[PDB]
């Protein structure tokens, strides 16, 4: 398994991040700041365990489609299922979202990952992209509410940069999935795991640092 290197590296970098975030957040008294620490640390924390699962090989399954027996890292969708709403919750709390928009974002987020999962396990190669289409659609709703649903200059300036980090990173995920072993098999799993590793550490630890250092 050639991509083991990017899984091992992902695991460690989610580890280093969880821990640094834990440290940095030793001391916080502020109820609000604690919240931002609870979320931000949990995210790579969970990401760590799941990257570990793929590295050790636990979160890895084969799906028969398109004549091949395709190895699919399911553990990603286990990761993403909890870490993605949490990321949205960082922005939501930041921007003082009404519970109405929180539920919407969280609800739409669950759909996104859920369809992504079903898509990933789909045995009929063509249906894979129907679920891709549904999932992407859900994605556009998030980016929608992020832009057009969502102010002290402190939160605003922090919001706009974290908002921007989200739009660009999350937009890359489907492309990878589409191009990768889940979709077209245009890029090998090796390159795909690398791209997903760059993205995840950027979308979590990267995103994380920007936040908790604000």
């Amino acid at each position: 398994r050639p991509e083991w290197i990017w899984l091992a590296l992902g695991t460690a970098l989610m580890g280093l991040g969880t821990l640094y975030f834990l440290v940095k957040g030793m001391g916080v008294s502020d109820p609000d700041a604690k919240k931002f620490y609870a979320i931000t640390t949990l995210v790579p924390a969970i990401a760590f365990t799941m990257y570990l699962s793929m590295l050790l090989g636990y979160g890895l399954t084969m799906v028969p489609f398109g004549g091949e027996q395709n190895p699919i890292y399911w553990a990603r969708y286990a990761d993403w299922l909890f870490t993605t709403p949490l990321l949205l919750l960082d922005l939501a709390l930041l921007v003082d979202a009404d519970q109405g928009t929180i539920l919407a974002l969280v609800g739409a987020d669950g759909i996104m990952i859920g369809t992504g999962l079903v898509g990933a396990l789909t045995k009929v190669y063509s249906y894979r992209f129907v679920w891709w289409a549904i999932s992407t659609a859900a994605m556009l709703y998030i980016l929608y509410v992020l832009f057009f649903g969502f102010m002290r200059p402190e939160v605003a300036s922090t919001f706009k940069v974290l908002r921007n980090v989200t739009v660009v990173l999350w937009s890359a995920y489907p492309v990878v999935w589409l191009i990768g072993s889940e979709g077209a098999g245009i890029v090998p799993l090796n390159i795909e795991t690398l791209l997903f590793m760059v993205l995840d550490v950027s979308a979590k630890v990267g995103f994380g640092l920007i936040l908790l250092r604000s």
Copy 2:
């Protein structure tokens, strides 16, 4: 698969509903009303994806019991797992339920569907109905709190009609399950899928319209 027609029809009607609900809820400023839009749209939204899963065939499994190899649409319990608490949350928010009754309803609701799931996958034909019995019991607790746990005339009148819609529809589900391919095999899967389709679109889009138009 003869019931494909009722799955296809279900899918479309959950689609038309999600979308109409999305539209209708373009504009809402009110924090409370947004909440009611978040929930009400999410419900058939999720229902859509799951009806799609059964139509495409993804949410369909065989369970060996009673000498046969029974096709069980598991995806229903995936649907119901999230859509049912949300329905209860519409009524709860409507009626200003204390968090105590919210947790109770949600908690009891999880049990209901969870036992329903286990029941559906049970390999010993007789145990199927033990889990049916547990699930139904949970159901009676919901209908209990709905009646005897739960006032501006606006919410009350809306509550009593939505409360009534719930009691009658949800009471039908076990009967179908008992009579259907999950339980007795008195009715064929075809008729059962139809009944479940009539119920779901009624319990979601039907229920939905009454609510958001109030």
Copy 3:
């Protein structure tokens, strides 16, 4: 299956407990007390169904490792997944925890059980204990926040006794798991199920009585 006796006994004692708790909590008007009733009753309620699942045999799977085909009661982790955060939520609400510490405890709790699950299903005997190590680590964070994150004398005195009940009981779980069929196979499944049964009824009904009678 020799441990059937401890599963049957567990089932009944979670049953007797759910029901007594239901009764005892007929009448509560207080919003806060209701909360404490919602949680405390839900816990053995869920525990009941899951103990039933292992008794009937539904929540039982074989995992190939260390040359054997080890029967693993997975249903425990289904139980623990919801009942453990609820227990933490009893203490949290009791002690008026900020949402920051609630999320942290709940988040860390999910990790604990999740890794425990993965560990339990791990096919490489040695990795089992890596996940054991991760899970335990998560545990120490809970006991940490319980001691050093967490006052009318009423809640305090109740908190310190329930806090103590938690530390001692929950500390036993890994030891059992380590010694038992999940880990070392030092103790037979029979003895292990007994120990887990003593613990669960103590950590739930036992813990429960102390709380709702306060």
